[PDB]
């Protein structure tokens, strides 16, 4: 019969999946596949929390497919290796994917599309990771993506209204389409565990950010209620509680496709109309989505978007190379408790607040260590659940004054910012247990504590907790000057 395969990469959901919906139509069998390669050299920089989040998305998908009399098929290897075999073994005639705007993904998908054509397989591609056809936004701007958010906003408002989300894949939608299943499915196609990827899990705490569509859809409602409670759709002022992972947080779910950006858009729209009594919302309502769309648009036609050299939009700043200073930053042993707490939260949980990101990124790059944004990007890629190629590269260039016309950022103080955010130091004591004995007077600068205070705290600076790795006052003075000199002669660095 007509045997269809839908290939999950992002778009890890059954709601608003136009590619899956179209593939099922007119099909006699359907098999949803995810191609997992945990040992791939290109994925050697993926950390354990990202693996766990992915696996939990896959377990969620498999569970929801069970309800529809189907299963997720997890295939190990590379797509170019496995898809020729699958086409023959399953007699496939249709293959669907959600479109991938990222340069490497466009190259991969063009190769699979050629393999599918060679084997007599129809390919269905549908845009749903982003709100818009990014190529149309670029054409509206004259052929190049915009590099300012205000310009991007102007372009977005000129696009045609969003189409309605695709119907959720239910049993009624699946209809006559069935999924052939084997008694040994779990053994041959099951979702692997962390231990099957080679990871120890002994003593590992439960995920602060559980993966999956089901979780994403619950959080969507919490997110909307919080904005309804305050009748304000702008992003809120950060306080110390904002540093903690929130049950309203959506960013990892948008990154993996657990939550449709278009569903988020219409839910926001309907809530604004009800609360504000206005059919015409401001574009600020969609801020989180449009900043995301902005960096996707800037990245799609730039294969060196994640590099400095050979990147047409990036200022060529002479960053220092310092592997040992970089490692102290990445491992949260800088000796500045505010910085180490943030880097520890990041490593332990996979998410940190936007201003916390500014803080640690300023320290690494333009503020204290003068290390390339490319290196902070790589660490965030390993640890940050909501980091993807486009967002991660774009944000690291933004904050390092390397692109997007960004210049005189505030130079964050690795002591004063934390003290002003959380004067009592609860955030420090939560993520840095060894410092719990320090009073608030010294919690952000423990090297200033008298010896008697350190001894009572059972934490000797230089032994139980590191000395500060730099003199922030001198280092920031020199780096502020270096960045001033670069922008005094900016064209010299194009």
From Swiss-Prot:
Span of the annotated motif LIR 12: 485-490
UniProt-reported outcome of changing residue 70 to D: Phosphomimetic mutant that leads to destabilization of the protein and abolishes ability to bind PER2
Motif (LIR 3): 150-155
Mutation effect (residue 279 to D): Phosphomimetic mutant that leads to destabilization of the protein and abolishes ability to bind PER2
Protein localization: Cytoplasm; Nucleus
Taxon lineage: Eukaryota, Metazoa, Chordata, Craniata, Vertebrata
Effect on the protein upon substituting residue 493 to A: Loss of interaction with MAP1LC3B and significant decrease in its autophagy-mediated degradation
Domain Photolyase/cryptochrome alpha/beta positions: 2-131
Name by which UniProt lists this protein: Cryptochrome-1
Top-level taxon of origin: Eukaryota
Consequence recorded when altering residue 246 to D: Reduced inhibition of CLOCK-BMAL1-mediated transcriptional activity
Domain notes: The LIR motifs (LC3-interacting region) 3 and 5 are required for its interaction with MAP1LC3B and for its autophagy-mediated degradation.
Span of the annotated motif LIR 6: 284-289
Post-translational modification: Phosphorylation on Ser-246 by MAPK is important for the inhibition of CLOCK-BMAL1-mediated transcriptional activity. Phosphorylation by CSNK1E requires interaction with PER1 or PER2. Phosphorylation at Ser-70 and Ser-279 by AMPK decreases protein stability. Ubiquitinated by the SCF(FBXL3) and SCF(FBXL21) complexes, regulating the balance between degradation and stabilization. The SCF(FBXL3) complex is mainly nuclear and mediates ubiquitination and subsequent degradation of CRY1. In contrast, cytoplasmic SCF(FBXL21) complex-mediated ubiquitination leads to stabilize CRY1 and counteract the activity of the SCF(FBXL3) complex. The SCF(FBXL3) and SCF(FBXL21) complexes probably mediate ubiquitination at different Lys residues.
LIR 8 (motif): residue ranges: 378-383
Annotated motif LIR 9, positions: 394-399
